[PDB]
């Protein structure tokens, strides 16, 4: 139960803004599943989640993914990745991470092998720069596109997925509602933390 996924990618595009968003959207979201971030035992408790933030090909010709957050007790490594994510990312502003979200799908896969005995799987991804790229994975067997990623995240599994970007709105939300299963990308609002994004 309560199988959530936390993703952010705008580190290269916009770092400080995330720090602001953390003060209003990221931190309250975690409190929905914990009595308060302190330092506790970690195991297969259902309510665990991951923390995935990477960069683009601009100044990283030797690294795309280094995620590691199986349980983290939802407090310690969560707060760590929040406050110690990154400060890099240059090049230009055309695309930061699309191939990342595909890997995110792969993460859900391991839940099928780990969360045996449903769980109403949920996921959330953040990215300031509007992404677009030809490559798909370059890391694993699975391959596709942004369209393939979203149809997998919606149809293949009923994972509720939203994108709480900065107050600005790019040309992304439009295509991300072409899924017959309700995407529910609504939680991009200055109002307080939604119950389940």
């Amino acid at each position: 139960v309560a199988d959530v996924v936390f993703v952010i990618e705008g580190t290269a595009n916009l770092g400080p803004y995330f720090e602001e968003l953390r003060k209003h959207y990221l931190l309250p979201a975690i409190e929905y599943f914990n009595g308060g971030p302190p330092d506790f035992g970690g195991d297969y408790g259902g309510t665990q989640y991951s923390l995935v933030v990477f960069n683009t090909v601009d100044c990283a010709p030797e690294s795309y993914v280094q995620c590691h957050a199986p349980t983290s007790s939802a407090y310690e490594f969560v707060t760590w990745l929040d406050g110690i994510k990154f400060m890099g990312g240059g090049g230009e502003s055309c695309s930061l991470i699309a191939e990342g979200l595909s890997t995110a799908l792969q993460l859900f896969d391991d839940f099928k092998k780990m969360r045996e005995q449903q769980t109403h799987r949920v996921c959330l991804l953040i990215c300031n720069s509007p992404p677009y790229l030809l490559p798909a994975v370059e890391s694993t067997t699975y391959s596709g596109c942004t369209t393939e990623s979203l149809v997998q995240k919606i149809g293949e599994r009923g994972i509720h997925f939203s994108i709480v970007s900065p107050r600005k709105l790019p040309a992304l939300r439009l295509l991300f509602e072409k899924a017959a299963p309700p995407a529910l990308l609504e939680p991009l609002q200055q109002p307080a933390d939604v119950s389940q994004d």
Partner: protein, 492 residues
């Protein structure tokens, strides 16, 4: 011949006898310069503007082995392994700042530095010839089992040269201990060289003492079992040896390098090594055994076969080495080229299996810098600085084929995002002008869509081509174009 440095106040250190040296980087910034001044510090130097040489004090003794992994600045600091791997990441790439990422191999002396991240890219250069393949078949990647994935993680696990069992206590980017203890055959003695990346996610190691006996402690090991534990295997692969001792005349060979390459199927660098020089080569060609002669009338087994061997004249080896199984007739670039500097002056660089002779233009340890044949001058002459020789790829002349090979390697460097140093290999920029013209033409026509992620980089590449000369115009023009485009795009 060209590109030589020197050290004014320091010299060969006549007080100390000697010390073994080593360095190797398949990525940018490929100077490490293990040496002894007049223990000692470790140096780092870039390929361009090598005037600003840098060094940093070490925290161990004899600095035996080091070999980086990726473009991320790192080093190993072996020989009792004090001050283990880390990044630099402080303000620039001129300060070591070895962090708390230390693996305490208590009073040991390993000579292993390996465990890279991902697969080797595939290059069908001869077949594709990059006509209109658009990087599809010209540059691919064969599916390869990632070592202990979870997302491909990586650690500095090595093999105990001094010790005889294993390395443990791995803490990659997780600060977790994970301490255990394994037996590892309860017996062994090794002076081997590592060959890690094999078919499965395992590691290979085999050598003990030299030509005297014929032992090879083949250790097929598995590390990926469960989190917070280790189950290092003790699978003894089929043994082998250097058949050099077949000569009833003499047997004084005593090899001391026997290094391998990342392709664990098609090499065996055993070699007779004061007062000797005789290279050897064996393979791993699986084949059944002749089960017969038992009467009137599992076949799967492995018995090694010979590949190449002859009598030569050389003392020091440097490094072993695209893919095989290609009829490289029209190909004359150093495809899988294995060369090594000769003690007696000039360097007879010649590919494998022929070793006959090449152009020479009559009247300790090294490694191959890159496809462009420019070696490093760490030959057996004492504490001497680096050297470079002619990178001529083959005997005859072929401007068309030349520029073809140049654009091939340029596109390869582009897709792999590595550094480029084929500068010394190319003729004056007129041919390079035609080359970049053809390059941008093919880029515009047959991108087909990777342009939107590959543009910026190649523009900088253009700079390099316009760097050397009269044609300094395109240099400044492209710099201003790039900076303006970048600033406006990020401001949008």
């Amino acid at each position: 011949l060209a590109y030589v440095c020197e050290w004014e106040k320091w010299a060969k250190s006549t007080y100390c006898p000697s010390l073994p040296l080593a360095c190797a980087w398949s990525c940018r910034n490929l100077i490490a310069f293990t040496t002894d001044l007049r223990t000692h510090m470790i140096h780092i130097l870039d390929t361009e503007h090598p005037w600003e040489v840098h060094s940093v004090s070490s925290g161990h003794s004899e600095a035996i082995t080091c070999l980086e992994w990726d473009q991320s600045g790192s080093r190993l600091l072996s020989a009792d392994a004090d001050g283990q791997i880390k990044c630099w990441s402080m303000a620039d790439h001129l300060a070591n700042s070895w962090e708390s990422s230390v693996g305490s191999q208590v009073e040991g002396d390993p000579i292993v530095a390996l465990s890279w991240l991902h697969n080797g890219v595939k290059l069908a250069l001869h077949v594709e010839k990059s006509g209109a393949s658009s990087f599809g078949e010209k540059f691919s990647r064969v599916k390869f089992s990632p070592s202990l994935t979870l997302k491909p993680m990586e650690g500095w696990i090595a093999v105990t040269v001094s010790g005889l069992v294993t390395v443990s206590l791995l803490k990659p980017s997780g600060q977790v201990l994970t301490s255990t203890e394994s037996l590892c055959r309860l017996r062994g003695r090794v002076a081997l060289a590592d060959i890690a990346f094999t078919g499965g996610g395992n590691i290979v190691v085999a050598a003990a003492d030299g030509s005297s006996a014929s032992p090879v402690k083949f250790y097929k090991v598995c590390v990926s079992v469960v989190s917070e534990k280790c189950r290092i295997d003790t699978e003894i692969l089929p043994s082998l040896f250097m058949r050099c001792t077949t000569d009833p005349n003499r047997k004084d060979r005593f090899p001391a390098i026997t290094h391998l390459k990342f392709l664990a199927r098609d090499m065996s660098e055993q070699v007779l090594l004061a007062t000797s020089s005789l290279v050897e080569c064996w393979s791993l060609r699986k084949e059944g055994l002749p089960v017969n002669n038992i009467f009137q009338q599992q076949p799967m087994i492995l018995k090694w076969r010979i590949l190449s061997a002859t009598n030569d004249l050389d003392r020091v080896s440097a490094v072993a080495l695209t893919d095989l199984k290609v009829a490289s007739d029209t190909q004359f670039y150093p495809g899988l080229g294995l060369a090594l500097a000769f003690q007696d002056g000039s360097v007879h660089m010649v590919h494998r299996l022929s070793l006959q002779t090449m152009a020479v233009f009559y009247s300790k340890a090294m490694q191959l810098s890159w496809t462009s044949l420019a070696l490093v001058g760490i030959d057996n002459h004492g504490k001497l600085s680096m050297l470079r020789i002619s990178p001529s790829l083959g005997h005859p002349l072929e401007p068309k084929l030349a520029l073809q090979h140049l654009l091939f390697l340029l596109e390869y460097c582009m897709v792999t995002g590595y550094d480029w140093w084929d500068i010394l290999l190319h003729v004056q920029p007129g041919m390079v002008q035609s080359l970049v013209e053809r390059l941008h033409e093919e880029y515009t026509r047959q991108k087909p869509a990777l342009q939107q992620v590959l543009s910026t980089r190649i523009l900088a590449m253009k700079a390099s081509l316009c760097k050397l000369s009269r044609v300094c115009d395109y240099h400044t023009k492209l710099f201003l174009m790039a900076i303006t485009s970048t600033l406006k795009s990020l401001l949008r």
